[PDB]
């Protein structure tokens, strides 16, 4: 299925980034400036993520994803929600790749 | 196994996404916007779950599933209930899958 | 005997869904909307369990369970009670099944 | 001894159900509705327990058990006493079962 | 000495019951109804206990035991005292039986 | 060993009873009735202890023992002292017994 | 040497009785009746220890101990002090004995 | 991949420096002077990071990174966001390095 | 060295007695009576310690020790200082004993 | 490569001095005298580090570090920031060195 | 180097003493009488310490040591300072002796 | 090693002394007298440290060292800084020493 993740080095790069940033948001509350920043960051990280994925997962991700509004600073809640979604989605994707590796390299 | 899960990678993917989002709802209370977003995510996530499930499990899931009304923003409580339901349903589903796998690996 | 649980995949599934939901009700209090929602879920979840059980256990479960009243929203308490009973009943059913399997595969 | 518990699967089911509900009573205080439901559950559960027990133990259990007064809702305390009793009685019963069983497995 | 405990399955049954009920009394305070109930329970459990014991221990137990008054509800303290007495007495009795088993089955 | 404990089962029995009751006195404060009952239990328990002890230990125990006056209800403190005394005396007694047993099992 | 503790069974007995009683005085405060009681127990317990000791240690212990005054109820403090001294003295005596035994059975 | 990180020693240095400083930001709130210094450190550190990275990753990092507004002192929050990002990006980068490396060491 | 502690059993007894009493001083504050008793115990205990020590260590201990002023009751603090000193002096003494002893047992 | 750290003894020395000092600033707040003192120590400590580094790392470190102003006492915060940066920078430098050594001694 | 500590049994004796007494000072605050006492003790312990040391360490110790004033009771702080100095000095000295023993007895 | 530490026993001695005194300063706040004494100890301890160090390390230490002015009593903060500095410098020094020792023991 590895046909799904075109650039894996890149997806565990960005996924690790977003995971880290979410762990930051939990730490302590943000101000308008920070929340704004993290929105921008989220848009860019999804751009870069679609690049490292096959059209299958690009479009699935697009279907699950809700872009943000720029006319308003999103809440610390919306930021937690938006990033947690991507963290779960990625962690389940790599669960797929690694379970495939273990079963197959077990036969072999 | 096929009679259960047509697309295993996809159902585990989406399942992890829902589990993580349930962990966020538990983390701290949401606002009007975030709980709205999570309502959407819940709807779309069921959409995407139906694809990787045989029609039996499609319809069983539907019988267990409770759509939200777009005429009111649901409470953090309803969101905890809706997401928790899919998390339990999914884990009992995959527990079935693994009992089947262990049966095969015991047979051969 | 084994003929008691006609569909084992399905009862471990639904059982896990009830287990999770009870854990949510314990988490923090629900509102009229949420607890109403779990009434619905409890009624249909029993339906779906009855599908996966032999006439013996269908009829026993029917004797032990007290359907909810549609005429009023049940308490956070009654929901814990109703879910807990099926959780204990199922966990004891599966304890019977697994001690039986260990007995047989201990024989052979 | 074997003659004591004629239906083992059923007495283990019912037992686990009773123990689980007792732990719910511990969780948080119940309302009049919940206390009523849990009383019923207690009565019906003794009904189902007598079935899987030899008349000897049927009658000993009945001598140790105390029906409730249907003219009044029992306290969360009376429910704790009654269920606690059946939980202890049951574990002390099966403890008999497995001490004899282990004696047999050591014998052969 | 096993000549002492005529019906052992029964004494570890009841002993386990009373132990459990005492663990309940410690949990949280009782009302008049519960304390009354637990008195009744104590009388019956001693009746059933004397049955499973040789005349030796029946009468020793009688000498150590103080029946309750029915003209008054005993305190949570008297109930703790009364049951703790029987729990200690039983646990020391089974200490006797099991130390005998280990020493003798060691020689043998 | 005989020169110490004429009836070992009985002295260990009663000893455990006293230890458990001391654990209850520690648990929470008693009332007029319960502390009265425990006074009785203490008297009777010494009665029963004398039987399983050689006359030497009968009289040594008596020299260490302090009867209560039936003209006043003793404090929870006096009860803690009286019961603690027998618990220590008994454990040092049985510690003597086990040093003797280990001597025999080392000899043969 | 070993001739110092004439009756070892008795001194480990009484020693354990003093150890327990000190642990009670620490538990919670005593009243005039209880602490009076421990005065009596301390005086006779020393008597009974003197029985089980060679002239050497009888006379040394007499030099170290300060009998109590019968003319006043001793403090919770003096009782802890008086009991603690015999506890340390005995524990050091038995440490000597056990290091001697290990030395001898190390020799042979 | 190897082509991705051209100067490994240098990118690891800079990374550890950034992670350490982020943990200082967590330690306690900073003053305007400290926030200014740490901003500078952030800018200079991205300068030094671009050097040890292939133009591919140079440009991806630049697309993900957000320069600060020198016309105002950023919050302790913006500093937490920016450094947190580079820490996640870096660990997800080197995670790529060692997953490929381990693949090679398993191959040969 | 061996020449240093002429009576080892006795110095170990006295030491354990002193250490135990110091821990009582720690337990809770003493009264004038207890402080007086414990002073006496301190004086008498140094008397008994000098006996089991060679004149060398007899005199070194006397040079390090400070008699108390019998014209006034010493604080719980002075008692902590004096006993604490003898406890440290004693452990540092026997530490000498066993370091030399272990040297011998490694030699042969 | 190894030619980067000209004097390794000296840089682990000075590095440990900075590590400890940062741990003190965290311990409890400093005064104008102390924090002035750490300004001096930071400036000279960088000097002494530059001695033990190849031209490469001297110049890089110079680019990353921001000397302090002699015209004002720096905050407890700036001191933590300034020390933390060198702590991370050094720890990353030595992580590079040790992974290189393990690589070489893994080769041979 | 053992030429340095002339009487080792004595230095670990006194060192252990002073260590213990310092652990006492930390426990709870002293009164004028106790602090005075512990000063006296410190002077004497240094006298006895110089005896068990070669002139080298006698004079080094003298150079590091600050005698106390007798015209004033030193603070609990000065007493902690004075004793901690000696505890550190001694522990470093014995670190020297024991590291010498291990390296040499390793060659040998 | 000689090029580093001319007198190893002495530098480790004094180092441990300084470490212990730093532990006391941390323990609890000092007075005018104690902090004065520790100033002296710090000066003298550097005096004594210079002896066991090659002239290189003498002068490096001096470049890192900051004397106190005898015209003012330094704060507990300055003392924490001054002592912490020597503790870090010393540990990085001895860490260098042990890397050298392990090099020798790996070579031979």
Rounded to the nearest angstrom, the minimum Cα separation between L60 and chain K is 22
- Contact assignment for E78 to F31 by CB distance below 8 Å: yes
Provide CB contacts within 8 A for I10, sequence distance 6+: G60, I48, I51, I52
Half-sphere exposure of D22 (CA within 13 A, CB side): 23
Structure tokens at F15: 């000893």
What is the C-alpha to C-alpha distance for residues L70 and L84, in angstroms, rounded to an integer?
A: 20
Structure tokens at G52: 């089980």
What is the C-alpha to C-alpha distance for residues L35 and L37, in angstroms, rounded to an integer?
A: 5
Q: Is D96 on the interface with E (CB under 8 A)?
A: yes
CA dist L68 → F65, H21, L19, L22, L43 (Å): 71, 31, 19, 17, 8
- Give percent helix, percent strand, percent coil of chain B, each to the nearest 5: 75, 0, 25
- Contact assignment for C77 to D30 by CB distance below 8 Å: yes
CA-derived radius of gyration, chain E: 15
Largest CA distance in chain J: 54
Q: Is B98 on the interface with C (CB under 8 A)?
A: no
Residue J93, classed as helix, strand or coil, is helix
Chain C residues inside the 8 Å CB shell of D16: 88-89, 91-92, 95
Structure tokens at C72: 């009023």
Return phi, psi of residue I35, to 5°: -60, -40
What is the C-alpha to C-alpha distance for residues J21 and L84, in angstroms, rounded to an integer?
A: 6
Best mutation site among H81, H91, H95, H103 for testing chain A: the one with the most A CBs within 10 Å? H81
Length of chain K: 108
- Contact assignment for K66 to L16 by CB distance below 8 Å: no
- Burial zone of E108 (CB within 10 Å; 0-12 exposed, 13-18 middle, 19+ buried): exposed
What is the C-alpha to C-alpha distance for residues F21 and E26, in angstroms, rounded to an integer?
A: 14
CA dist F37 → A5, E46, E79, F47, G31 (Å): 77, 17, 11, 15, 20
What is the C-alpha to C-alpha distance for residues H99 and A18, in angstroms, rounded to an integer?
A: 19
Could you tell me if H97 and H1 are in contact, meaning their C-beta atoms sit under 8 angstroms apart?
yes
Of D105, L107, B94, L35, the residue nearest C12 (C-alpha): B94
Our CA angle for A76, A79, A82, nearest 5°, is 150
Of J43, J35, J44, the residue nearest J77 (C-alpha): J35
Of E49, E34, E14, E48, the residue nearest E79 (C-alpha): E34
What is the C-alpha to C-alpha distance for residues C16 and C11, in angstroms, rounded to an integer?
A: 8
- Could you tell me if residue K50 is left (phi over 0), alpha (psi between -120 and 50 degrees) or otherwise beta? alpha
What is the C-alpha to C-alpha distance for residues L50 and F22, in angstroms, rounded to an integer?
A: 66
Chain I residues inside the 8 Å CB shell of K42: none
- Contact assignment for D81 to E21 by CB distance below 8 Å: yes
Structure tokens at E28: 């949280």
Structure tokens at L95: 């860490």
Partner residue facing E88 (CB), from F16, F33, F48? F16
Could you tell me if J88 and H17 are in contact, meaning their C-beta atoms sit under 8 angstroms apart?
yes
What is the C-alpha to C-alpha distance for residues L76 and D80, in angstroms, rounded to an integer?
A: 60
Structure tokens at J57: 């790392």
What is the C-alpha to C-alpha distance for residues I40 and I71, in angstroms, rounded to an integer?
A: 13
- Contact assignment for G33 to F75 by CB distance below 8 Å: yes
H-run or E-run covering K51: helix K32-51
Ranges of H-type helices in H1-108 = 8-27, 32-51, 55-64, 76-107
Residue of A nearest to B19 (CA): A88
Contact between chain E and chain D (3 or more Cβ pairs less than 8 Å apart): yes
Q: Is H62 on the interface with A (CB under 8 A)?
A: no
Rounded to the nearest angstrom, the minimum Cα separation between A34 and chain H is 5
Buried b (16+ CB within 10 A) or exposed e, F59-73: ebbeebbeebeeeeb
CA dist C1 → C63, C96, D97, F6, J101 (Å): 20, 10, 20, 54, 65
Could you tell me if H21 and J81 are in contact, meaning their C-beta atoms sit under 8 angstroms apart?
yes
Buried b (16+ CB within 10 A) or exposed e, J16-46: bbbbbbbebbeeeebeeebbbbbbebbeebb
Q: List chains touching G (3+ CB pairs under 8 A).
A: F, I
Return phi, psi of residue H30, to 5°: -100, 170
Could you tell me if B76 and B25 are in contact, meaning their C-beta atoms sit under 8 angstroms apart?
yes
Largest CA distance in chain F: 55
What is the C-alpha to C-alpha distance for residues D89 and D93, in angstroms, rounded to an integer?
A: 6
Contact between chain E and chain B (3 or more Cβ pairs less than 8 Å apart): no
What is the C-alpha to C-alpha distance for residues K81 and K38, in angstroms, rounded to an integer?
A: 12
Could you tell me if I65 and G91 are in contact, meaning their C-beta atoms sit under 8 angstroms apart?
no
Rounded to the nearest angstrom, the minimum Cα separation between G50 and chain F is 13
DSSP class of residue F28? S
Q: Give the count of Cβ contacts less than 8 A between chain J and L.
A: 83
Chain K residues inside the 8 Å CB shell of I5: none
Q: Render L25-81 in DSSP notation, one character per residue.
A: HHHS---HHHHHHHHHHHHHHHHHHHHTS-HHHHHHHHHH--PPPTTSPPPHHHHHH
Count other C-beta atoms under 10 Å from residue L40's C-beta: 13
CA dist B42 → C14, F63, H71, J9 (Å): 19, 79, 42, 59
Structure tokens at D19: 């123990």
Residue J98, classed as helix, strand or coil, is helix
Ranges of H-type helices in E7-75 = 8-27, 32-51, 55-64
Q: Render A14-54 in DSSP notation, one character per residue.
A: HHHHHHHHHHHHHHSPPPHHHHHHHHHHHHHHHHHHHHTS-
What is the C-alpha to C-alpha distance for residues C25 and E68, in angstroms, rounded to an integer?
A: 42
Return phi, psi of residue I107, to 5°: -65, -55
What is the C-alpha to C-alpha distance for residues K59 and D60, in angstroms, rounded to an integer?
A: 89
Buried b (16+ CB within 10 A) or exposed e, G48-64: bbeebbeeebbebbeeb
Our CA angle for B92, B93, B99, nearest 5°, is 85
- Burial zone of K69 (CB within 10 Å; 0-12 exposed, 13-18 middle, 19+ buried): exposed
CA-derived radius of gyration, chain J: 15
Could you tell me if H76 and H39 are in contact, meaning their C-beta atoms sit under 8 angstroms apart?
no
Q: Is C40 on the interface with B (CB under 8 A)?
A: yes
Best mutation site among I28, I92, I101, I103 for testing chain K: the one with the most K CBs within 10 Å? I92
Residue C105, classed as helix, strand or coil, is helix
Structure tokens at B5: 């899960």
Residue tagged 């010494």 (tokens): F46
What is the C-alpha to C-alpha distance for residues I67 and K41, in angstroms, rounded to an integer?
A: 12
CA torsion L30-L31-L33-L36 (nearest 10°) is: 60
Strand ranges in chain I using DSSP code E only, listed in sequence order: none
Of I51, I83, I53, I49, the residue nearest I66 (C-alpha): I83
Count other C-beta atoms under 10 Å from residue E54's C-beta: 14
CA dist F85 → D45, E58, I15 (Å): 47, 27, 26
What is the C-alpha to C-alpha distance for residues F77 and F57, in angstroms, rounded to an integer?
A: 26
Provide CB contacts within 8 A for K13, sequence distance 6+: I89, I92, I93, I95, I96
Return phi, psi of residue G31, to 5°: -105, 175
What is the C-alpha to C-alpha distance for residues I59 and H69, in angstroms, rounded to an integer?
A: 79
Of A39, A48, A38, A54, the residue nearest A11 (C-alpha): A48
Q: Is H60 on the interface with A (CB under 8 A)?
A: yes
Residue L86, classed as helix, strand or coil, is helix
What is the C-alpha to C-alpha distance for residues H98 and A90, in angstroms, rounded to an integer?
A: 19
Residue tagged 């950023």 (tokens): H74
CA dist G49 → F60, G18, G42, G89, L79 (Å): 11, 11, 10, 12, 57
Could you tell me if E25 and E56 are in contact, meaning their C-beta atoms sit under 8 angstroms apart?
no
- Contact assignment for K13 to I95 by CB distance below 8 Å: yes
Q: Is G50 on the interface with F (CB under 8 A)?
A: no
What is the C-alpha to C-alpha distance for residues C39 and J18, in angstroms, rounded to an integer?
A: 63
Structure tokens at B77: 């409580």
Could you tell me if B18 and A67 are in contact, meaning their C-beta atoms sit under 8 angstroms apart?
no
- Contact assignment for G88 to I16 by CB distance below 8 Å: yes
Could you tell me if B22 and B78 are in contact, meaning their C-beta atoms sit under 8 angstroms apart?
no
What is the C-alpha to C-alpha distance for residues J67 and J82, in angstroms, rounded to an integer?
A: 9
Residue of L nearest to K62 (CA): L44
Cα four-point dihedral sign D78, D81, D85, D87: positive
- Contact assignment for B16 to A88 by CB distance below 8 Å: yes
Could you tell me if L65 and J21 are in contact, meaning their C-beta atoms sit under 8 angstroms apart?
no
- Contact assignment for B81 to C27 by CB distance below 8 Å: no
Provide CB contacts within 8 A for F10, sequence distance 6+: E60, F48, F51, F52
Structure tokens at E81: 């005292």
Q: Is B5 on the interface with A (CB under 8 A)?
A: no
CA-derived radius of gyration, chain K: 15
H-run or E-run covering F30: none
What is the C-alpha to C-alpha distance for residues B64 and B60, in angstroms, rounded to an integer?
A: 6
Count other C-beta atoms under 10 Å from residue D6's C-beta: 15
Residue D65, classed as helix, strand or coil, is coil
Could you tell me if C53 and C96 are in contact, meaning their C-beta atoms sit under 8 angstroms apart?
no
Cα four-point dihedral sign L14, L15, L16, L17: positive
Count other C-beta atoms under 10 Å from residue G31's C-beta: 15
What is the C-alpha to C-alpha distance for residues E69 and E3, in angstroms, rounded to an integer?
A: 33
Could you tell me if K6 and K53 are in contact, meaning their C-beta atoms sit under 8 angstroms apart?
yes
Strand ranges in chain D using DSSP code E only, listed in sequence order: none
Rounded to the nearest angstrom, the minimum Cα separation between K41 and chain I is 7
Domain boundaries, chain I: 1-108
Our CA angle for A21, A27, A33, nearest 5°, is 65
Largest CA distance in chain C: 54
Residue E72, classed as helix, strand or coil, is coil
Structure tokens at B43: 């709807």
Structure tokens at C104: 């047989």
Could you tell me if E21 and D85 are in contact, meaning their C-beta atoms sit under 8 angstroms apart?
yes
Provide CB contacts within 8 A for J50, sequence distance 6+: J58, J61, J62
Half-sphere exposure of B60 (CA within 13 A, CB side): 25
Rounded to the nearest angstrom, the minimum Cα separation between J105 and chain H is 15
Could you tell me if K18 and K83 are in contact, meaning their C-beta atoms sit under 8 angstroms apart?
yes
What is the C-alpha to C-alpha distance for residues E9 and L95, in angstroms, rounded to an integer?
A: 68
What is the C-alpha to C-alpha distance for residues E82 and E75, in angstroms, rounded to an integer?
A: 10
What is the C-alpha to C-alpha distance for residues J90 and J16, in angstroms, rounded to an integer?
A: 10
What is the C-alpha to C-alpha distance for residues I44 and I24, in angstroms, rounded to an integer?
A: 18
- Burial zone of E39 (CB within 10 Å; 0-12 exposed, 13-18 middle, 19+ buried): buried
Q: Render B63-106 in DSSP notation, one character per residue.
A: HH--PPPTTSPPPHHHHHHHHHHHHHHHHHHHHHHHHHHHHHHH
Count other C-beta atoms under 10 Å from residue J98's C-beta: 10
């Amino acid at each position: 299925l590895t046909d799904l993740v075109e650039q894996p080095a890149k997806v565990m790069r960005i996924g690790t980034m977003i995971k880290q940033l979410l762990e930051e948001v939990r730490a302590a509350p943000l101000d308008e400036a920070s929340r704004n920043r993290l929105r921008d960051i989220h848009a860019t990280s999804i751009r870069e993520l679609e690049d490292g994925l096959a059209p299958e997962l690009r479009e699935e991700l697009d279907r699950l994803t809700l872009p943000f509004n720029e006319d308003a600073v999103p809440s610390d809640a919306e930021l937690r929600i938006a990033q947690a979604q991507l963290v779960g989605w990625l962690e389940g994707l790599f669960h797929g790749i690694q379970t495939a590796l273990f079963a197959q390299q077990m036969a072999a």
